[PDB]
Design a protein around this ligand. Structure first.
Ligand SMILES: CC(=O)N(c1cc(O)ccc1C)c1cn(C(C)=O)c2ccccc12
Length: 116
């Protein structure tokens, strides 16, 4: 409360750490469905069904331009990519399985990186 400060983690390295994680995501073999935005003009259903499209290149732009207030808003956008993928794709399709793989890959990196 007022004049009572909770000890809080050192967040000075978060930008660098999130960029590192995003780089590893971008270079993962199964990253290909997520490297660019879904083409809203060529993919029927997507624009109407997926209310908040997100992809790695958009996250990279936002990260490079100071549009993430904190590390949690970054993680939200990464998870949005995979939540969108699950909504639109069958689990056993190539894109669907890529998304599950990439979510697992992300969440372990997230855990290993930030609760030291
Ligand atoms: C151009 C395009 O729309 N896609 C795409 C396809 C690729 O092979 C490589 C990269 C991308 C961005 C699609 C991504 N999709 C996802 C993530 O569900 C889709 C879901 C349905 C149809 C297309 C896509």
């Amino acid at each position: 409360s007022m004049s009572v400060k909770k000890p809080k983690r050192d967040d000075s390295k978060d930008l660098a750490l999130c960029s590192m994680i995003l780089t590893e995501m971008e270079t993962h073999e199964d990253a290909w469905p997520f490297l660019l935005p879904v083409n809203l003009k060529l993919v029927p259903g997507y624009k109407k069904v997926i209310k908040k499209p997100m992809d790695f290149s958009t996250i990279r732009e936002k990260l490079s331009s100071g549009q993430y207030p904190n590390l949690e808003t970054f993680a939200l956008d990464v998870r949005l990519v995979f939540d969108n993928c699950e909504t639109f794709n069958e689990d056993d399709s190539d894109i669907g399985r890529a998304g599950h793989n990439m979510r697992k890959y992300f969440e372990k990196k997230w855990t290993d990186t930030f609760k030291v």
